[PDB]
């Protein structure tokens, strides 16, 4: 499919060695088949657009979707995830940390590989749904000072939605288990960051990343020098379609996600 394929020739020498081809597998297909089914639920979608519209001014669209349990998203399948971190289906470690975990269904894929699961989230309705899954939600600025390191720190599709992504990256490194610890990181490209407010307003981020280029293969090459600056090198990475449930107009929605595995340097 046209979602998983990149011109490897336009990747740099560092990145041509760590690319991991992905595939439209049976777990991404379960998701589309549910998304399509949920779009088919006429009464539910109208009800979602009725609520989402009334309260457009008081709340952010993130928390509205979390209010309604709608808008769940997808970055990788169990099998795709295991194929990127290179681990068995029965692999297991102590502690995961999902920064900006959203509604939790993307963490719910990573979940069975850790016996403790931590999440941070700026949105009050998301945080509940994260708690609904028995996840320990931490303070946005509290996961750094816990007293314990994190075996895998997850940070998917946040660097284009937070205020200080560089401080975040440097923070992940400071509390990540140094020996066997890895971070799994997801970026939408064409990189276009903004900080979400309420009512539709959007401030700009207080820190700028240099994820710049004319195509996917170009902006990804911008990231080794970036990731290097925060103490990581790319152990593997892949192209995946960032997918999201639909409304009354489209059965689902697709953004262009780069997923990396970074090792402490």
């Amino acid at each position: 499919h046209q979602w998983y394929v990149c011109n490897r020739e336009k990747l740099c020498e560092s990145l041509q060695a760590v690319f991991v081809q992905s595939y439209l597998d049976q777990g991404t297909q379960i998701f589309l088949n549910n998304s399509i089914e949920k779009s088919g639920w006429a009464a539910i979608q109208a009800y979602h657009s009725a609520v989402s519209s009334a309260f457009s001014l008081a709340m952010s669209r993130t928390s509205i979707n979390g209010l309604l349990g709608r808008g769940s998203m997808f970055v990788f399948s169990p099998d795709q995830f295991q194929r990127l971190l290179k681990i068995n289906p029965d692999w297991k470690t102590h502690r995961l940390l999902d920064l900006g975990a959203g509604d939790g269904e993307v963490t719910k894929i990573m979940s069975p590989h850790f016996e403790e699961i931590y999440a941070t989230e700026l949105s009050e309705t998301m945080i509940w749904q994260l708690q609904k899954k028995k996840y320990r939600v931490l303070g946005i600025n509290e996961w750094q000072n816990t007293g314990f390191q994190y075996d895998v720190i997850s940070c998917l599709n946040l660097l284009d939605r937070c205020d200080q992504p560089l401080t975040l990256l440097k923070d992940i490194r400071s509390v990540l288990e140094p020996t066997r610890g890895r971070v799994i990181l997801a970026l939408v490209l064409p990189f276009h960051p903004y900080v979400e407010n309420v009512g539709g307003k959007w401030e700009k981020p207080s820190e700028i990343l240099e994820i710049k280029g004319q195509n996917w293969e170009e902006q990804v090459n911008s990231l080794p020098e970036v990731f290097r600056k925060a103490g990581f090198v790319i152990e593997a990475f892949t192209r995946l379609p960032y997918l999201c449930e639909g409304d009354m107009y489209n059965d689902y929605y697709v953004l262009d996600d780069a997923v990396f595995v970074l090792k402490p340097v």
């Binding site: 989402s52 993130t62 998203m73 939605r161 939408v188 979400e196 999201c244 929605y253 697709v254």
Partner: peptide, 7 residues
């Protein structure tokens, strides 16, 4: 609407 990642 559109993608929940935002716009």
């Amino acid at each position: 609407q559109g993608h929940a990642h935002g716009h």
